[PDB]
Structure 1
Amino acid sequence: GAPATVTEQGEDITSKKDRGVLKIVKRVGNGEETPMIGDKVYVHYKGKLSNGKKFDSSHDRNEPFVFSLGKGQVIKAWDIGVATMKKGEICHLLCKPEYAYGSAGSLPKIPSNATLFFEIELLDFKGE
């Protein structure tokens, strides 16, 4: 399925090249511009665990998730991955635990040492 495909066929987008964050662009976005550090970014996403279960979805809440990029407001994989996206892009990200919740996890939902899979749509970005 899609998690296997990004695992086996995705691009390593880490500066370290440590295969910690892998990406496939699923729906090509607009032009060339990506958000810059500190921009307010609006996304829709879903997340799955490696047991095959969906653990979260913004779609199901009927509103996007909004954060300030590159500030550590989200897991490292998200700051890295969203920074690569164009407006309107949909991607798949595979996030090893070192770029997510690590050995601690985040109970109740995120186990220790969890590799996370996301589908992410970048709706918009704006400077404040």
Structure 2
Amino acid sequence: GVEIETISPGDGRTFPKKGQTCVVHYTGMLQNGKKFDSSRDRNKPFKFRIGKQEVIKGFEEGAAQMSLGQRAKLTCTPDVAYGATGHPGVIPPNATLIFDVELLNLE
């Protein structure tokens, strides 16, 4: 259940592929709640690649459905990230997640 809500500007052509290492400014948001995570805090913008299941499934499908310079808004369903489990102390079980994602990558 990946729904993309894009703030317009960017290119719409540089799509990330497998074996490509990308740079994402993410920011976590809880539905009807406070924040829990931000790459803007540490300002080391989380260099990761595509094709190793490093990220969670809802964030992974949100990566390939974006392009260079775009600014989307993810809405991750509980069943793809942590809904049955819950990340201990940080994410409760059955939690729907919101992410502020801008793709300023390379490659």
Greater strand content: 1
Of 68, 80, 96 in structure 2, the residue corresponding to residue 99 of structure 1 is 80
RMSD: 1.3
The answer to whether the aligner puts 1:110 opposite 2:91 as a matched pair is: yes
Runs of 4+ in 1 over 6 A off after TM superposition: none
78 and 70 in structure 1: CA distance in 2 versus 1, 3 angstrom threshold:
farther
The gaps in structure 2 that reach 5 residues or longer are none
The gaps in structure 1 that reach 5 residues or longer are 1-19
Counterparts of 1:40-119 in structure 2, within 5 Å, are 40-119=21-100
Residue 125 of structure 1 is matched in structure 2 by: 106
Structure 2 residue matching 1:56: 3-state secondary structure: coil
Aligned residues of 1:102 and 1:114 also touching (Cα < 8 A)? yes
Instruction: Tell which has more relative contact order, 1 or 2 (C-alpha 8 A, sep 6+).
Output: 2
TM-score relative to the length of structure 1: 0.78
Deviations 1:5-39 (CA, angstroms, capped at 9, x unpaired):
xxxxxxxxxxxxxxx11110114322412110121
Counterparts of 1:7-22 in structure 2, within 5 Å, are 20-22=1-3
The percent identity for this pair of structures is: 48
Structure 1 residue matching 2:7: 3-state secondary structure: strand
Aligned residues of 1:41 and 1:124 also touching (Cα < 8 A)? yes
TM-score relative to the length of structure 2: 0.92
